[PDB]
Amino acid sequence: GLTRRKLDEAIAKMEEAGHQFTKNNANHYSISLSEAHMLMDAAGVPKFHER
DNA sequence: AAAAAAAAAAAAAAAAAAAAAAAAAAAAAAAAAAAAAAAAAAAAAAAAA
């Protein structure tokens, strides 16, 4: 449920760190499930409890 | 000479079998539906006119 602009904001906040968004056989960003968790953990979306 | 008694006979009654008829069951189809499998059109990502 993250709009494209929100997801680009999240990856602009995240990617400059040491993390690399692992790509599959192609360049397509193959964000692992844990990668997605971390991304939206620090993306700024409050959890169902922390909100 | 005639009567009665005795003996060798047809007709009716009872039981079983073979013809046929109807219904039900096994089967043996030609047709359809559902599920499965083998390709395809908008969106997304990175390096470069």
- Indicate yes or no: strand B within 7 A of the C-beta of A5: no
**Structural contact between residues A17 and A25, judged by C-beta atoms closer than 8 angstroms:** no
Mark residues 23-42 of chain A whose C-beta is closer than 7 A to nucleic acid strand B: 23, 27-29
- Indicate yes or no: strand B within 7 A of the C-beta of A44: no
Q: How far is the CA of A20 from the C1' of B10 (A)?
A: 128
**Structural contact between residues A15 and A23, judged by C-beta atoms closer than 8 angstroms:** no
Q: Token pair for residue A6? A: 């929100």
**Structural contact between residues A8 and A37, judged by C-beta atoms closer than 8 angstroms:** no
User: Solved by what technique?
Assistant: cryo-EM
Return the DSSP state at A46.
P
A40 closest CA partner among A50, A28, A24, A27: A50
**Structural contact between residues A2 and A40, judged by C-beta atoms closer than 8 angstroms:** yes
Report how far Cα A16 is from the mean position of its chain's Cα atoms: 12
Q: Token pair for residue A36? A: 């997605």
